[PDB]
Amino acid sequence: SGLSYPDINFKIFSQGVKNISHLAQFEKALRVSLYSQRLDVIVRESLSSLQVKLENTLALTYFTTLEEIDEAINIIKNLSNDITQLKQLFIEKTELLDKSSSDLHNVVIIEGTDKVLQAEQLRQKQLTEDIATKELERKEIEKKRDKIIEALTDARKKLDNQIDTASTRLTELNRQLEQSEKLIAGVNAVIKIDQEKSAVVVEAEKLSRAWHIFIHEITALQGTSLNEVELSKPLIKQQIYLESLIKQL
C-alpha cells in the first residue's frame, strides 16, 4: 500500500524491436532478433490476453456479487477462486515474460567486436598509405608514357605492362578498402543493435516489475472478501494502465 506503477515508455521498446528486426543486414546478430521477437510476441499477446481477462473478470466480479445482492456460501468459493486464478494468470505471465527477458539478456555480441575494429583501423591506415604510393608510381609511369607517346613503339607498348600491373594493384587495394569499410559499418551496426536491444531488455524488466506491483496489490486483498466496491478499483486501475500500455505500440 502506497506504491506507484513505474513509468514505461514503450515507444523505445516498439521502435527498438522494429530497428533490430529491420537491422538484420550488413551472422549472430540474426539470433538476437529471433529471441527479441519471441519476447516481442510474448508481451504482444500477453498484455492483450491480460486485458480481455481483466475486463471479463470485471464483468464476472459484479456478476458473482450480483448473486450476493440477490439476497436483498458458494459465491465466496468461486469468487476468491476466480480472483486468485486472475492472480495466477499474472504469476505465469510474469514468469513467462521475465523468462524471455532474462533469456534474451544472456546472449551478447560485444567483447568480440572491438577487436575487429582495432585490426581494421591499422589495416585501413596501411591501405590509405600504400594506395597513395602506388598511385604515385602509376602517375610517374603515366608521365613517362604521355611524354613519349606525344611525339620506340615497342617501349611505348611495354610500359603498358607496368601500367596494367599498377592499375590491377590499385583495383586490388580499393576493393580491400571497401571490404574494411563494410566491416567497420557492420561492427558499428552491431553496436547500435546492442544499444537498442539493451533498451528493450530494460523496458521488459520495467513491465515485469509493473505486473509484479499489480499482483502485489491483488495479494493485498487476501481472502477477507468483505467489499466489492474496493475490489473493482485496482482491477480497473490496472485496466486503464495496461490499456494505455496497449495503446502505446
Numbering used by the authors: 10 to 35, 45 to 90, 109 to 187, 246 to 343
From the paper:
We have unraveled structures of the soluble components and the pore assembly of the YaxAB cytolysin from Y. enterocolitica. In line with our finding that the isolated YaxA and YaxB head domains form spoked oligomers in solution, the YaxB head domain in isolation was sufficient for recruitment to membrane-bound YaxA. Together, our biochemical data support a role for YaxA as the initial membrane-interacting subunit of the toxin, able to bring the lytic effector YaxB to the target cell surface.
Our structural data confirmed that YaxB is a true homolog to PaxB, with a RMSD of 2.1 Å across 210 Cα pairs. Notably, the YaxB foot domain could not be resolved in the 2Fo–Fc electron density map and therefore remains unmodeled. Because our monomeric YaxB model was incomplete (with the foot domain not resolved in the electron density map), we superposed both monomeric YaxB and PaxB coordinates with protomeric YaxB.
